[PDB]
Each structure stands twice: as structure tokens, then as C-alpha cells.
């Protein structure tokens, strides 16, 4: 049963997207909120995001979106180190800050601030063992930053069938017509 899902996608860059504004967000949000509605219908009890600028803040968004309904639906933010925003944007720092405040739970794998690649390496193990399932915002064509996490997960699925979820672009595009 997934009860805890880990959800990770694309950072602002690498899909254009630069202000809340904004046309294509709202069809990413409304298919994140569609997806999580499902879950939710199959017993879901915790999103757990790093903070992550992009899809994972945008997740937890939508997440909080939904707990007036679902008011089970339990938000997570567990960071790799501290201060991961420190040279994001003033705006960028703002959203960031807001998913934090309202997380219903939050904390450091450790107490520093970046050091090495190892401490995002120990937090995808981390998320993926601790985890039901893996949820990406994510395409097999344009691949990017979150095929690393993926792979984490392909290696558990190949273990013991850790279930992995996709919104592509073709995902986007049915969000939109419907």
C-alpha cells in the first residue's frame, strides 16, 4: 500500500518557467493535484519532497491545495544540509520558505550546509528506501536533473517492484485538453 510518496520533477530552468504567473504551471499543478486525488482514493498519507526549487515545491503546493479535502494529507520536507536557498532568488527564496512554514514535518539529513555531492547521493537513498513509491514530473526524451533520483528508484524497483509514476509532456498535453 503507498502511503508515502516521494515526489521529485524538473527545477524552473529547465522548463522556461520563471514567474507563478503562468500559463503552463497551472496545467502542471492541475496534473500533479489529479494525480495526488488518486493516491489520496488509494490510502496516500504522506508527499515527501527536499525542497527542491520546481516540481517539488509546486508539489507541496498542490498538496496543501488539497487538505481541505483531505485533511490526512500529510506534507514532508526533509532537506540533503541546511540553507539550500541561500542563492535562489528573493521570489524563489519566498516559495521556498512558504512550503517550509507549513510542512507538517521538516528536518536536515545533516546539520551543514553544502559540502559534497555525497549528501544528495545519501538523500535519494534515503527518500527512495524510506518511500512507498517515487512520483516525477519528468521526461525520457529531454531526460535532465531528476534522472539521477530515478535511477535510485529503477534500482530498487528491479529489487522488490517500488512503483514508479510519470507526468511527461504528453501528460501535460492530456491535462490540457481535458
Same mark, same amino acid.
Do not use: C
Given at each position: 500500500?503507498?502511503?508515502?510518496?516521494? +515526489?521529485?520533477?524538473?527545477?524552473?530552468?529547465?522548463?522556461?518557467?520563471?514567474?507563478?504567473?503562468?500559463?503552463?504551471?497551472?496545467?502542471?499543478?492541475?496534473? +500533479?493535484?489529479?494525480?495526488?486525488?488518486?493516491?489520496?482514493?488509494?490510502?496516500?498519507?504522506?508527499?515527501?519532497?527536499?525542497?527542491?526549487?520546481?516540481?517539488?515545491?509546486?508539489?507541496?503546493?498542490?498538496?496543501?491545495?488539497?487538505?481541505?479535502?483531505?485533511?490526512? *494529507?500529510?506534507?514532508?520536507?526533509?532537506?540533503?544540509?541546511?540553507?539550500?536557498?541561500?542563492?535562489?532568488?528573493?521570489?524563489?527564496?519566498?516559495?521556498?520558505?512558504?512550503?517550509?512554514?507549513?510542512?507538517?514535518?521538516?528536518?536536515?539529513?545533516?546539520?551543514?550546509?553544502?559540502?559534497?555531492?555525497?549528501?544528495?547521493?545519501?538523500?535519494?537513498?534515503?527518500? +527512495?528506501?524510506?518511500?512507498?513509491?517515487?512520483?516525477? *514530473?519528468?521526461?525520457?526524451?529531454?531526460?535532465?536533473?531528476?534522472?539521477?533520483?530515478?535511477?535510485?528508484?529503477?534500482?530498487?524497483?528491479?529489487?522488490?517492484?517500488?512503483?514508479?509514476?510519470?507526468?511527461?509532456?504528453?501528460?501535460?498535453?492530456?491535462?490540457?485538453?481535458?
Amino acid at each position: 500500500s503507498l502511503k508515502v510518496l516521494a +515526489i521529485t520533477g524538473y527545477k524552473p530552468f529547465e522548463l522556461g518557467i520563471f514567474k507563478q504567473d503562468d500559463k503552463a504551471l497551472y496545467y502542471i499543478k492541475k496534473a +500533479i493535484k489529479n494525480r495526488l486525488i488518486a493516491f489520496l482514493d488509494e490510502g496516500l498519507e504522506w508527499i515527501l519532497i527536499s525542497g527542491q526549487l520546481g516540481v517539488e515545491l509546486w508539489a507541496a503546493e498542490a498538496a496543501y491545495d488539497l487538505q481541505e479535502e483531505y485533511p490526512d *494529507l500529510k506534507v514532508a520536507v526533509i532537506t540533503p544540509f541546511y540553507e539550500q536557498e541561500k542563492n535562489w532568488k528573493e521570489p524563489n527564496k519566498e516559495q521556498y520558505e512558504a512550503v517550509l512554514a507549513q510542512a507538517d514535518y521538516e528536518a536536515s539529513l545533516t546539520h551543514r550546509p553544502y559540502e559534497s555531492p555525497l549528501q544528495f547521493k545519501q538523500k535519494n537513498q534515503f527518500f +527512495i528506501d524510506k518511500s512507498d513509491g517515487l512520483l516525477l *514530473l519528468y521526461d525520457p526524451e529531454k531526460e535532465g536533473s531528476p534522472k539521477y533520483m530515478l535511477g535510485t528508484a529503477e534500482k530498487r524497483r528491479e529489487q522488490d517492484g517500488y512503483p514508479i509514476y510519470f507526468i511527461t509532456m504528453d501528460d501535460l498535453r492530456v491535462t490540457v485538453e481535458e
